Structure 1
Amino acid sequence: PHLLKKVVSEVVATFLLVFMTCGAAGISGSDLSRISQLGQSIAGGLIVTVMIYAVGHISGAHMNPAVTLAFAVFRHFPWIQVPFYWAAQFTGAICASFVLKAVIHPVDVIGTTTPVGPHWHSLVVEVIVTFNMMFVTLAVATDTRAVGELAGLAVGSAVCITSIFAGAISGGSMNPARTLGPALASNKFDGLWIYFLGPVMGTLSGAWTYTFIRFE
């Protein structure tokens, strides 16, 4: 039901998503005098917001398979469309990290999200922060799909918190599509089981938690 412009918007968003979000964390993860560490989180959070303004009213700016999933679980999102977005997201992302592999000549750690210390630390973090994000994503979404000025602020804000804090433990992802892309350009795949089960379990738990308390 009008899924072409939805998926072009979902790919073009996920590309500019990953291209920006890793390219500052990857560059920063190679010279912190070149791009600040708080600067790679702020950059990563701002970019989520502007894609909600760009494609939020068209596709919904899902950009996140564990979110497209969470919408299909809780607010009636077309199950016949979730494969098309999942596809659309993984594509724009994986494409980007390679596009940067070439634009950031010296550095070949393109924002790897790899667990720090005990691998489970990340999982508890990657569910609590993903829960957090999906929780607020759901309290602000308008069902065309995550639309509007404050939807951009809420989700971008949540995401930014994740880079600052969950970045010290998990690297801070919450998005199976965005760990995978970079993991391929730098061939480091340490702990990927957590960047699927943290999120999928984080979005569904947090989304479920919202529908619980839903009306006042």
Structure 2
Amino acid sequence: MVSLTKRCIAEFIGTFILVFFGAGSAAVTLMIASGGTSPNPFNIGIGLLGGLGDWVAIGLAFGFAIAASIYALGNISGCHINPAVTIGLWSVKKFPGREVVPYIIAQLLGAAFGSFIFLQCAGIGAATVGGLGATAPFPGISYWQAMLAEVVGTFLLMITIMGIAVDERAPKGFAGIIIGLTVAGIITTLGNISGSSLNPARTFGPYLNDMIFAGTDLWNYYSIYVIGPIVGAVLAALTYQYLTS
């Protein structure tokens, strides 16, 4: 109904909001905790002052921002704001393959830009101390461990999306808040393991800005936040297709 051009602008805004607010809270957490003493290496400083409370706070910053976006942009573009979701939807004939790349590009741009504008609001400390909320494996977590966390996490996100936003029997009006709260929950447990990206674009944004405004190069991890989410999403979409078949 809405032109692909405007739906792409919407996806841009939605992913911008997602990275600005979600990743922003993570960065800010590290900034107000910087200089504190951690009990052990696993605690990189996010759960330093508020324990798991800090992780639920970050998860909620993501969740509420996501819910708000879905309610604001859902009717416009469907508010995927996540490459893995677009692909997941695509994998079960729920989204036109012809629009997959356009959306993904708008998502990637929005994420990059969202991370950039936040970096301007909070100063350079957000990048040099908060790392702009970039998702990377945590201390003691191997490459495949983070991979696994990302597929199980994105699996939950997608199967929830399938059940509450795609299935025709879903309760109207609940998709936005449920999808958001679900992400908040996944981040609460999987955050201190892989950072709980569940979104290739959510990771892309921070990575990019982190490299340009900091001598950082986290790209040797990106594959985790690309393959993991995509595999998790498609697995969920198909699984749900089978269970309701």
Question: What pairs with 1:156-167 in structure 2 (closer than 5 Å)?
Answer: 156-167=180-191
Mind listing any 5+ residue stretches in structure 1 that lack a counterpart?
Answer: none
Mind listing any 5+ residue stretches in structure 2 that lack a counterpart?
Answer: 34-48, 212-216
Report the equivalent of 1:202. Answer: 232
Query: By how many angstroms is 1:9 displaced?
Result: 1.1
Percent identity between the two aligned chains: 34
Distance, in Å, in 2 between the alignment partners of 1:182 and 1:59 is: 24
Query: By how many angstroms is 1:76 displaced?
Result: 3.2
Q: TM-score, normalised by structure 1?
A: 0.91
RMSD: 2.2
Report the equivalent of 2:126. Answer: 107
Report the equivalent of 1:180. Answer: 204
Query: By how many angstroms is 1:29 displaced?
Result: 2.2
Report the CA distance shift for 1:197/1:173 in structure 2 as closer, same or farther (over 3 A).
same
Distance, in Å, in 1 between the alignment partners of 2:24 and 2:172 is: 27
Amino acid at match of 1:212: Y
Query: By how many angstroms is 1:168 displaced?
Result: 1.3
Tell whether 2:48 aligns with 1:30. no
Cα contact 1:179–1:195 (8 A) shared by 2: yes
Amino acid at match of 1:19: F
Cα contact 1:110–1:182 (8 A) shared by 2: yes
Amino acid at match of 2:60: I
Report the CA distance shift for 1:147/1:183 in structure 2 as closer, same or farther (over 3 A).
farther
Bigger CA drift: 69-78 or 55-64?
69-78
Q: Deviations over 1:19-58 (max 9, x none)?
A: 1111111111222469944322211111111111011122
Report the CA distance shift for 1:68/1:147 in structure 2 as closer, same or farther (over 3 A).
farther
Q: TM-score, normalised by structure 2?
A: 0.81
Distance, in Å, in 2 between the alignment partners of 1:107 and 1:51 is: 24
Report the equivalent of 2:43. Answer: none
Amino acid at match of 1:56: G
Aligned length: 214
Q: Deviations over 1:139-194 (max 9, x none)?
A: 111489x9952111221122111211110111000100010110112224152111
Report the equivalent of 2:8. Answer: 7
Report the CA distance shift for 1:209/1:94 in structure 2 as closer, same or farther (over 3 A).
same
Distance, in Å, in 1 between the alignment partners of 2:64 and 2:153 is: 17
Question: What pairs with 1:1-216 in structure 2 (closer than 5 Å)?
Answer: 2-32=3-33, 36-105=54-123, 106-108=125-127, 109-116=131-138, 117-142=141-166, 148-187=172-211, 188-189=217-218, 190-214=220-244
Amino acid at match of 1:111: G
Bigger CA drift: 43-52 or 181-190?
181-190
Query: By how many angstroms is 1:112 displaced?
Result: 1.3
Distance, in Å, in 2 between the alignment partners of 1:166 and 1:15 is: 22
Q: Deviations over 1:95-118 (max 9, x none)?
A: 111112221113311001001221
Cα contact 2:58–2:184 (8 A) shared by 1: no
